[PDB]
Amino acid sequence: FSNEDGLEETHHVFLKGNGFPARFASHPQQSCIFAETGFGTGLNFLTLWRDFALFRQQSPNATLRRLHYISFEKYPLHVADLASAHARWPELASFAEQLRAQWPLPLAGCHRILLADGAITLDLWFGDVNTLLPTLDDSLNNQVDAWFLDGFAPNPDMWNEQLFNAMARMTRPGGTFSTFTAAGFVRRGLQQAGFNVTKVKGFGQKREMLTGTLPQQIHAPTAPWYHRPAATRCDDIAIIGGGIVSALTALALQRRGAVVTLYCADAQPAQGASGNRQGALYPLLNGKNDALETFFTSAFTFARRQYDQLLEQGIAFDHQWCGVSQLAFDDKSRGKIEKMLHTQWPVEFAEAMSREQLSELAGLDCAHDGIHYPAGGWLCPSDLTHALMMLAQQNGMTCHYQHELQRLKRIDSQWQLTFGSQAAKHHATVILATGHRLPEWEQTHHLPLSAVRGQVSHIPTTPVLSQLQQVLCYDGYLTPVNPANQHHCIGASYQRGDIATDFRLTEQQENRERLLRCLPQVSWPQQVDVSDNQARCGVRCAIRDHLPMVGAVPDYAATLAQYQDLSRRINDIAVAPVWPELFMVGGLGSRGLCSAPLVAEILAAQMFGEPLPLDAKTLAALNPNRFWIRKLLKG
Ligand SMILES: Cc1cc2nc3c(=O)[nH]c(=O)nc-3n(C[C@H](O)[C@H](O)[C@H](O)COP(=O)(O)OP(=O)(O)OC[C@H]3O[C@@H](n4cnc5c(N)ncnc54)[C@H](O)[C@@H]3O)c2cc1C
Numbered sequence: 001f002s003n004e005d006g007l008e009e010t011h012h013v014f015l016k017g018n019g020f021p022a023r024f025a026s027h028p029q030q031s032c033i034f035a036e037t038g039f040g041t042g043l044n045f046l047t048l049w050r051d052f053a054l055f056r057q058q059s060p061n062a063t064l065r066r067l068h069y070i071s072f073e074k075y076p077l078h079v080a081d082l083a084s085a086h087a088r089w090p091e092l093a094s095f096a097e098q099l100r101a102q103w104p105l106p107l108a109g110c111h112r113i114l115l116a117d118g119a120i121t122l123d124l125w126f127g128d129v130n131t132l133l134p135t136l137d138d139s140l141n142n143q144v145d146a147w148f149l150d151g152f153a154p155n156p157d158m159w160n161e162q163l164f165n166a167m168a169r170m171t172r173p174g175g176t177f178s179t180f181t182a183a184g185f186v187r188r189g190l191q192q193a194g195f196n197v198t199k200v201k202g203f204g205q206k207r208e209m210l211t212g213t214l215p216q217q218i219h220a221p222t223a224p225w226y227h228r229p230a231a232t233r234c235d236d237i238a239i240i241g242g243g244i245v246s247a248l249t250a251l252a253l254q255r256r257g258a259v260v261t262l263y264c265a266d267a268q269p270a271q272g273a274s275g276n277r278q279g280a281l282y283p284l285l286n287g288k289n290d291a292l293e294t295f296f297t298s299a300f301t302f303a304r305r306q307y308d309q310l311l312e313q314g315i316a317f318d319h320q321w322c323g324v325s326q327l328a329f330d331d332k333s334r335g336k337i338e339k340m341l342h343t344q345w346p347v348e349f350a351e352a353m354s355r356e357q358l359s360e361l362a363g364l365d366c367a368h369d370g371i372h373y374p375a376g377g378w379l380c381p382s383d384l385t386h387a388l389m390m391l392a393q394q395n396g397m398t399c400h401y402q403h404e405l406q407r408l409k410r411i412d413s414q415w416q417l418t419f420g421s422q423a424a425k426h427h428a429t430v431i432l433a434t435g436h437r438l439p440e441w442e443q444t445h446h447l448p449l450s451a452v453r454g455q456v457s458h459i460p461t462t463p464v465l466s467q468l469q470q471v472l473c474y475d476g477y478l479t480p481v482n483p484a485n486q487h488h489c490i491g492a493s494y495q496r497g498d499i500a501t502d503f504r505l506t507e508q509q510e511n512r513e514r515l516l517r518c519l520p521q522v523s524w525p526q527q528v529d530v531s532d533n534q535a536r537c538g539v540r541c542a543i544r545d546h547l548p549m550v551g552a553v554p555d556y557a558a559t560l561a562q563y564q565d566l567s568r569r570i571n572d573i574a575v576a577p578v579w580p581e582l583f584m585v586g587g588l589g590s591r592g593l594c595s596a597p598l599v600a601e602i603l604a605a606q607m608f609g610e611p612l613p614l615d616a617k618t619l620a621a622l623n624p625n626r627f628w629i630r631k632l633l634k635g
């Protein structure tokens, strides 16, 4: 037993300083929230994990079942650096391996990693703490049970009042912190932030150090107009849906121990918009660093990781992570791509490429230059949705197919559900995930959701078409052959106000026309043949700002009456009015394969009142009431 590896230190300063592991056992909630300034090689996180795992082995019936860890790192290391430093701590080896298996690219923003079969949520915030904290969401307030105040020795950049004030704002009352320093200005900084502070002996030799406790909740400037309320009960949830996002939301809720039931109008899941054979998965970038791009940057990477974790657990679905090549086939598209390339992306996420480079990758002359997304690809969303639905079923979700909801009505603390004609059901909490049909309710009909038919053609491959290795995106898209069926998909029509799903010949020809029109300089696209008239049709739910809608279903009448006064006020203002115990997720447009997993996880986390994985503007930009709140916020 030495001190030289720094493991005993970590345990003394950060775990014991916050009352662990004793505190695991007395902890009164199902989850415990830790936050850390810095992350480094993960020493504090891995040590905590190890202890929390020993505690779960020893007390499988204790209240505490889950750990959430929030970390702020300005200088994210590469996974090889992580591996190299973890050689010092072989006793952490197996936790370390699971961590490194999911370590993300150095992209600015929040990256949520699900570890230990869902018992651990790791929110990695890559960016400067100081510029980050004022951007964070109200869902982080009053949440944190214990802080690991780590980093360089008070170098002074990090240890300002702005950090201490954010920390207290984010601390639950009774929540605590510990740090390795005892610098006077840090002590004074944490007191003025609102903590009680105690000075104690450092580990072994040097230093004194500091611990403390937040005696009272800091009521801090909120944004009540974009409030994200929890469900009061998660032991009785009914999902109305049956597409990709219903299954992901199911699973994200089951990880938290919710009980969920599915009602789906069709005989089978994935008979709506989620039913194609091959769909494209890549991020939507703009180079504007707005809410849209911020969301898609997190969403894409989060979706790839979840899809890989699922595949690792034995879930099966056709797919190739073959890369996506988006072509500058046009003045407009070239301009858009040019703007994206002004932000400096790691080439592991998005890379500018010449016509030659794209074609080299593609196996076919791509006719233009553009941008390449090497982790994008295609998946069979039909297989994926059936697979995730099956998994949710195996894990406890009962499924009632051919249950088209016709009437939804709150009565005496329950939602009464009338179908088309099976028995009426009633539930404490409901979630609407019905895609293009979302705004058909008296409760949802003032939400600006638009419905857009598309038709995707199914085409036989040929020796030349088989050569294609990437998804090609132009004004439309063409996937590589699915080697399991020897067919490709090429789409898609985009018909606003049109919800019929009948095969149309005109639209079948247009899927080929689009390709021929956008790559006129090459001849292989002539090998596309749509004359067997095989296609699939479906209907997207589009939103004019191109971002999903996820959250509580907002109450129009009360919102307008309650915020007529809002602009003058900006005071202590009431939270956004909503229908009680009613939530929604959808508005996925044409990018649901990319956006679905993160919105699902956002919705589950919200309904459980947990900290959310995005900043305030990006969450406000996903909130269902946003188009209204935007007006009222200016008059
Ligand atoms: C032509 C086309 C091309 C596409 N290409 C891509 C692509 O390249 N990449 C990509 O990521 N995505 C693509 N998409 C999919 C897009 O991402 C969709 O927005 C997404 O699949 C919708 O998923 P969802 O779960 O929200 O809704 P859906 O899959 O449409 O499911 C809605 C479900 O709700 C059920 N329902 C509706 N009303 C009721 C009711 N009253 N009672 C009970 N149940 C009800 C239905 O039974 C249905 O199962 C494409 C879609 C289309 C149509």
Ligand SMILES: [Cl-]
Binding pocket: 276, 277, 278, 279, 280, 381
């Ligand atoms: Cl699809």
